[PDB]
């Protein structure tokens, strides 16, 4: 492939460099339309800019935490972090979010990796070996109420059991209700006067509940869960302007008030170098 062809002096009536940008086109002008060039080859394919590659590496999408401790006398397991749920999202930690929102609709399978590490912040004789249970709870399933409910039987709901310190990995097909996930949605769920704007089920990817299977030892053990997400089989439509201001909320476009100028001011003139 040639990156530049050889081209010499020109004295024409045919001027490729004068255009009318009002038309909305970006005319494909090249170095050889306005200087004299020599042949050179590309030596490159643009492999690593493919959208499959761009969205295809694992990104941290969620960090939560649960603890193993005596539940005796706990009136609210959920509240003691005896167990914890997470409604899956890709817009809570901003790194991956800005990447996805370069597109309007996106379609892909997900590969999740879940790393779990334990901490024992206060005096323990040892490090126990805990098994985590991660249950995938689709909308309409009974939700766990205690850390050892009938729910955890999970007879119809996919669940994975792995050890703290290890990693669990499985992949879920594209679960969207429509043909693509909406990265944006300028609508409501119905014509209600007060219903929420922008947040939609069109994006919904399920939800996940974590708990330790082990009963309690004498000390307490903090287990912190990190969920990583990798898109595989990516398809993206309609590019948009990149995110400039900071994010404030999952699912709305809102930016913070009295934010700071995002364009760097010159130290000098327009004329400055």
């Amino acid at each position: 492939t040639v990156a530049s062809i050889s081209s010499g002096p020109k004295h024409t009536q045919k001027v490729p460099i004068l255009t009318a940008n009002e038309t909305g086109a970006t005319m494909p002008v090249l170095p050889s339309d306005s200087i004299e060039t020599r042949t050179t080859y590309m030596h490159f394919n643009g492999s690593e800019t493919d959208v499959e590659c761009f969205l295809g590496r694992a990104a941290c999408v969620h960090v939560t935490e649960i603890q193993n401790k005596d539940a005796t006398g706990i009136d609210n397991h959920r509240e003691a972090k005896l167990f914890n749920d997470w409604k899956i999202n890709l817009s809570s930690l901003v790194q991956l979010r800005k990447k996805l929102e370069l597109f309007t609709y996106v379609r892909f399978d997900s590969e999740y990796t879940i790393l779990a590490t334990a901490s024992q912040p206060d005096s323990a004789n040892y490090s126990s070996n805990l098994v985590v249970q991660a249950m995938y709870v689709p909308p309409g399933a009974p939700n766990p109420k205690e850390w050892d409910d009938y729910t955890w039987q999970s007879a119809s709901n996919p669940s994975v059991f792995f050890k703290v310190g290890d990693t669990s990995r499985f992949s879920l097909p594209y679960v969207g209700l429509a043909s693509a996930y909406n990265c944006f949605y300028d609508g409501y769920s119905h014509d209600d006067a007060e219903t929420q704007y922008g947040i939609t089920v069109l994006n919904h990817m399920g939800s996940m509940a974590f708990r330790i299977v082990n009963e309690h030892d004498e000390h307490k053990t903090l287990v912190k869960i990190r969920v990583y997400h990798r898109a595989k089989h990516v398809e993206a439509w309609i590019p948009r302007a990149p995110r400039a201001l900071p994010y404030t909320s999952i699912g709305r476009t809102n930016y913070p008030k009295n934010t700071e100028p995002v364009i760097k001011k010159r130290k000098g003139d327009i004329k400055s170098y």
């Binding site: 009002e22 970006t26 002008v29 679960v175 699912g251 001011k265």
Partner: protein, 236 residues
């Protein structure tokens, strides 16, 4: 039972590896795809669309006005604007090109810089745009500027002029984050003759300026952008 040996790296999680995994939802049938206009396949497809450069960066809070390069009637010989070409920083940085370049470590290729004139139709002007390849200082006067890559632009019916910064380089890749060894030059613009307004007309006229990449362009070695960060996880 077949005998095996495990190598160094067993059990590691590399966020960039690509392997098979069990599906959690065995046998599930995804929604059919329907047709949607606009599919993107490569980021190289989109960095060829031009977008506006806030060249007039001199303000103090972001404003629509930093997209406008002003022009003065009757000045002769003088300089319209100047900038270095660190596409990952400075004026370029918020443009779509600048914004994508920042997802990669290295770039190579030609850039297309165009200026669209917005003055009254009955006015006229001749400007010179000059690209100064690495190695010399930003030009200080047109004489200096005109000895490097340049285009005399004659403002006419055809409203825009497309200047190309041809890839001039020893090393075949440059860093997107500004680096010296790897630096690309300067871009300046001067009156060639001068802007002239018709009667009954007055004041400043402005040029809009765009940037996009030539088909020439290469970007490689993906990394994280300095353009976005956060202090606590967001919630709904």
């Amino acid at each position: 039972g077949l005998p095996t040996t495990t190598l160094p790296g067993s059990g590691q999680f590399l966020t960039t590896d690509d392997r098979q995994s069990p599906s959690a939802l065995p046998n599930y049938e995804p929604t059919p795809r329907i047709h949607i206009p606009g599919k993107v396949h490569n980021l190289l497809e989109i960095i060829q669309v031009d977008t506006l450069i806030p060249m007039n960066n001199t303000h103090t809070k972001d404003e629509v006005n930093s997209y406008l390069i002003p022009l003065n009637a009757n000045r002769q010989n003088e300089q319209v604007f100047g900038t270095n070409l660190f596409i990952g920083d400075g004026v370029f940085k918020t443009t779509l090109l600048g914004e994508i370049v920042q997802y990669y470590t290295h770039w190579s290729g030609s850039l297309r810089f165009s200026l669209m004139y917005t003055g009254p139709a009955l006015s006229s002007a001749k400007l010179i745009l000059a690209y100064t390849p690495p190695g010399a200082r930003g030009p200080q006067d047109r004489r200096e500027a005109m000895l490097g890559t340049h285009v005399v632009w004659d403002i006419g019916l055809q409203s825009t002029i497309v200047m190309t910064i041809p890839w001039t380089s020893g090393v075949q890749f440059r860093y997107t984050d500004p680096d010296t060894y790897t630096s690309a030059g300067f871009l300046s613009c001067w009156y060639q003759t001068s802007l002239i307004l018709p009667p009954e007309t007055t004041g400043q006229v402005y040029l809009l300026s765009f940037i996009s990449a030539c088909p020439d362009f290469k970007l490689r070695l993906m990394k994280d952008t300095q353009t976005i960060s956060q202090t606590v996880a967001l919630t709904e």
